[PDB]
Amino acid sequence: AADTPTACCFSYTSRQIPQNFIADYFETSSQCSKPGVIFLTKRSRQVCADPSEEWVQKYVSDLELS
C-alpha cells in the first residue's frame, strides 16, 4: 500500500530502550524534515530515535547482523 502516510520524527526519545524490548527498526524516509530511526518494541510500540546516537547505531547494527 501507498498513498499511505509516511512516518516522520519530530522529536526523539531522551533515554535508551532496554535492548531486549526491541523487535525491529526502520529508517524514516528522506522526505522528512529530520532523519530518524523508528524502533518497534515487543508490545508493538513505535519509538523515534536519533540516528546519530551510538546506541541507536549499535541497536540497528545488532538487528541487521541477526
Place this chain on the structure above:
Amino acid sequence: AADTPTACCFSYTSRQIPQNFIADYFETSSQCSKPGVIFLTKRSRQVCADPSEEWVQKYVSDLELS
C-alpha cells in the same frame, strides 16, 4: 502514547474515494511539510487526500456532523 512517529502526506490520492467507504478521518500534524487528511476506510486502508479539494472538505464536515 508518544514518542510515536507522526504521520505526514507527501502526495494525495487522485481519485475521490466513494463516500460510503469512509469510516473516519484525521488531519496531519502542523509539523508536516504539507497539509493533509488521512481518510480511514471501512477496510482500514489509510488514504492521504488534499484538504483543499472540495470533496475532502465535504467528507470531513459530514463526519463531524454525525
